[model samples]
Target: NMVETEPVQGCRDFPPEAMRCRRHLFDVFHATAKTFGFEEYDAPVLESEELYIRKAGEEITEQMFNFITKGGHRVALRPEMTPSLARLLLGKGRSLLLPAKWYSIPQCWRYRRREHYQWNMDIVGVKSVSAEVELVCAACWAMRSLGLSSKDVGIKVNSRKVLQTVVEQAGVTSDKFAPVCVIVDKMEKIPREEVEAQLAVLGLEPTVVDAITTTLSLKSIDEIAQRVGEEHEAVKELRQFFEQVEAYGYGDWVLFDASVVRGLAYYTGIVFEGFDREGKFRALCGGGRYDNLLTTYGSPTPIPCAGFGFGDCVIVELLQEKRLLPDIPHVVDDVVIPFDESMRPHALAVLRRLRDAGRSADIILDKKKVVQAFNYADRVGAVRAVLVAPEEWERGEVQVKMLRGFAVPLDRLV
Candidate 1:
């Protein structure tokens, strides 16, 4: 064994079966994005290390698989899509259109731990909650298209403005807000005291810690507005966002959760996290607005953008757990066979014809008996078999056999 047999530790080997499953998931992703009016785009996996470096404590930045290239340039395998999305926009400058809706499914990588594909759909230039509303509804539609219902999954919605104002009122500095969110983002997973302790380390007083703890407990919008004051913009945006989702008939797939400030440092407003209602799996997706991300990337003016990221791993796991993922075998439309060595050239010609007619066809490459050709055809899940024999060729026809046994004219063989 001179060569290695295993793939990289964190990456996966998608044998035919696994590839079909992957295709199953991606088809729905592409279909959903197009239906929502989002155009597809992509970037190379290798991105500048600078694109991801940020002041906020984020695992997306901390775990990038970065390295120096032969030219002594710093680059990394992208861990997320938003930074690249922003880079693509910034690189376009003023030539790019506003209110742009873009989407992508990139195989992002972390330092040493690889993950499955991530689906990204972003809206740029629109500042209203309508952008968030459309993005959230599109996510809901994608899940439902894959056989998931509101009962199986739901997205928790929140505006950072709510918690931002809370911290500001408690006298916490603006620079500390994101770090405070990095702590609050873990409140549901880590202990409450742990979160408060982490916040205190950032110079947040006990009052701010108490308010942070209290905000996570408020279950309804009424409670939120009552505590934060109804005039607050967060309350108004939250109300408006929910109303739009309701208009799309996905109100049931979304709910208000004050605790869902996404882990990303760039999120400036209206963060959300998707989860399975049974609480049996990791969060299904995450996204929110990052109005200043382009500015941080050196754009002269601000570009308002918001969208979400859905990972293939958790959703596939969920589909497997519920037995919703069905096995899909590779299939072809037709298999062409040469009756004998003398007919091989004729079979090749017939194969060309079938392909030119937009049919998926295979020509037996080996010199084999007629029954053996049929066996190969059956194993490949082909719908029909075309036998190119001397007599059939002279007649300008092919002996099309099982799965269909008949003589079809060469012009109609496809």
Candidate 2:
């Protein structure tokens, strides 16, 4: 009776059934990652606060769950996992082998009360677009394993450099690039007029805003390149990447949209997002290439890498909405009922025998009428209720009443 407070908002306390569902999802996540040869890895949940302090933008800094410790050192519950991955790579330096394929399911915390389990997968030291193709394939497989079909979700592909080309053409300078990208990232969440107004506040000319916004509306890679400039590096890269996806048989799961300029300042090339087809929830996952992230961490040189983070919440919500959550039951296989308290020793002995033979069985604790014992058996979901009456005990036989309304002898159970 000491409990008085409400549970914290945006946090979860999963009961048995909920935990079983979560376990099933995690199992699917791990099995899919393994199928692609991606090894599981982990990093400390608490990391140096300085790791996230950078030009990644004001949004991330405002939400970080950070504070100063008694030792006067600043630390934070990790708000994202990529920074930790970057740190790990930097520490290993050239000693770490190339073409590293790794994945982690870590809990990310934010001060604004958003807590989630993030599924992170990354490929390092591979400059080719094949890495992106493989990562996307892995994501598709994970979704399929969760019982989602191609009609349920899509991978929206775009490129930062592609958008940058059009933004620069609109007269925005390199200094304003990151801010514009951040605003464009909100185009789906905010009104078009509001996004334009924010761009105006950044000192962008009205015509520049119109041009950038118009370019972002284009869908096809070829059409976007034609509208911006066909020779742009991002365009060429995407053209090649798209063909590879088709050749690899994942074409049905992905599409191109010029508006996917991921908000992070680190992404240099292709950025993509996995979202529900009806746009009912937040992105299921998002990531892209960050060639210079290592350099930001004080590395002498940049390491080419691409990765994405998928959370456990939105996807599960989507599954529930689709009525795809599997039914998991908690029930014993058999319940033993003694004729009276005097029959307990024989009942327990029978219970042990059934258990030793790899069957689930339990015994009632007190005296009960035969009809009352059957009610208890029904309540516990026992498939069969074994009766230990004197006649059966004297005959060296056990009588079982199946929940389905049939009686069978123990010798005939098999």
Candidate 3:
């Protein structure tokens, strides 16, 4: 007999139960996303390698899954969805109306064998704070669909321009702005000394470093703005972003974490990352304004877009930790118990009836005793079991034993 080899190294194949969990959760995600008027989209899995190389910086380029086809064209399985989404927006141009709303659930592949299901939800083609507020509201809806309440998760939002203004207020100039913001992004993830060390590595003055560190340690935007208050566009934007979040009615879901700057170099305005309520993972979802990615993709449309990718792994981990992943029924029925060979045809008939009636009932295929069939039903979380004995088949009837309750018939299995 032909046989199969083992799964490839480092990559994973989810077993039956886990696959059920992923599917059910994503179903909830899609349902909530569409309710927000966002269109469902899917891009090709394979893309030109250079396109990603242009945007994601070195860490991604080094780890991308790349190859030259037999036709001698270089391509890669897409490591991220945003670039292709950006390309699509550029292609759309002004043809459609303003503020295109779109979301995608795509299987992302990478080198060293990291494969994951990622949901990229974005509202493009608009530049208003109202659009940003809508994105946040949609994110809250997605989380709530997964059974997370406002108390279970919080979105920490801040603007890159605000941080730049904070840094410049402390004496760093425009040339050092990018490096300073990048180091600040890692401050929460690394040791304080190491973060400061990286700042000096990028060649900022020692006083500038001290000022940046001081502002980072401050508790809120109001406190930080007190010192850097005047003539700073970033301070103004941060205040406005927070006000907009509040006006949008997600104030309780928002926080003003100075260190919320995402690691990507592309974000140009407000950025935020959601965290577990207990603060376990780094970020469940994060995104910010990228007003210029269209220009990079050759559109130069200046459409401000912001969205977040809620990957399956970290959110599932949070759900497990919170004890929120419901005990959804994974197996529709347990133990399709066959009757004696004579009752097999009757058993199949009863099974079909139960299924068509919107019940997940199983027959006892093993020729087991009635007690044994009941035991299997309880073991697999099935509420009912179909029984087709010799007598029942002769009588033109079936029996559905309710495992959870006293042994009884459910509509005589129809």
Candidate 4:
């Protein structure tokens, strides 16, 4: 019987070429974060199950990979990075500085038999709407670096405060706001009737449901507060936000839409999500201000923060759909081939000298015919093949061959 050789379902095995492409994407992620003055940080992948169970909302909890250890301690593989980020910031306590900006790329796991790498950047201790603007700007920069234009992707901006204002004006109590937000968060996912059914189950009056759904359909900031109320706080915040957006040259990168509630129970203010223009994929990334999250994590006081998470999976799919993947070639400068058993030492010496001179060099183990050695070198993407023949070895010289049937001395190879 033969044992099957395959990766676990929903898990991936990256061959050399695939890994190179992944690293290229990660390099763009790193350079973009650094350009915006965001520092990199990290957290443990496993933590007390209670950490995530606390406030990640039902959608996230349903997908969590959690189990109890023999020691009677319950733990879970992180389904997302925010809760772990909160714990890291709070653990720093008073020693940490204010308005800290940090970024991380964490691999998150879920019990739905899925695993993926998530890229995140967060700002803590900043209450100004400017923090939200800055995060949005960083996301735009990242997308641009990956060869996506503003026309190819859009950042949809909204505010829970705007939704809250409309909901309250329609007579929905404060306690009922969360479930309403949850249902509205699925406005794009679930069918229209199901959304209405969920809202009806919330015990909201028909007038309240119409008011809430109507506001969600409005796409202009000018009409947002007009429908909710002229003096609504959400309106003023959005006005200031757009001013910054225009001033910062990001006006073309985003749109104002009231339907983006972001599903998380923690988002208290502005929210945004990135999506491909064709809408062939899920949200490219989503996040908003979660002011009370640290307090829920047992911090002595609430920490005002805003951030977003970008996954490695769907974005790659979008890139493929758009044919935007960068060409990542395997790079080897030269392969040193020995012509005979006695010429092996000469090949080794030549390879070492090429490397010492700052060129990438590899060797063909065991003696082989020069033609066979050249075949291996070409297959491995070597630009040139260096041959150590007995005649050349006697003269302390070697032969280098290139694609154009040109031959050169070892000293001329570099």
User: Quick one: ranking by TM-score, best first?
Assistant: 1, 4, 2, 3
The segments of candidate 2 whose C-alpha lies over 4 angstroms from its true place after superposition are 168-175, 201-203, 228-231, 331-414
- For candidate 1, write residues 195-305 as lDDT tens digits: 888888888789778888898888988999999899899899999999889988998999998878878887889988889999999889899999988987899999999
Least accurate 10 contiguous residues by lDDT in model 1 = 108-117
State the displacement of the C-alpha of residue 309, model 2, in Å, after optimal TM-score superposition: 1.3
> Best lDDT goes to which candidate?
1
| lDDT by residue for model 4 (79-194), tens | 89998888888889989999899999999998734899889999999988999999898888888898999989989998899778777777788778877887788878889888
Cα lDDT, model 4, residue 262: 86
Residue 354 displacement in candidate 4 (angstroms): 3.0
Cα lDDT, model 2, residue 332: 84
lDDT of each candidate versus the true structure: 0.89, 0.85, 0.73, 0.85
Which one is best on TM-score?
1
- The reply for model 1, stretches above 4 Å from the true place, is 402-404
Task: Point out the higher-scoring one by lDDT: 2 or 3.
Answer: 2
Error of 2 at 399 (Å): 6.7
* TM-score for each candidate, following the candidate numbering: 0.96, 0.83, 0.82, 0.92
Mind giving the per-residue lDDT tens digits that candidate 2 earns over 275-303?
A: 99988998898889989889878899789
Each model's total of backbone clashes: 1, 0, 8, 0
Question: Cα miss at 7, model 3 (Å)?
Answer: 3.8
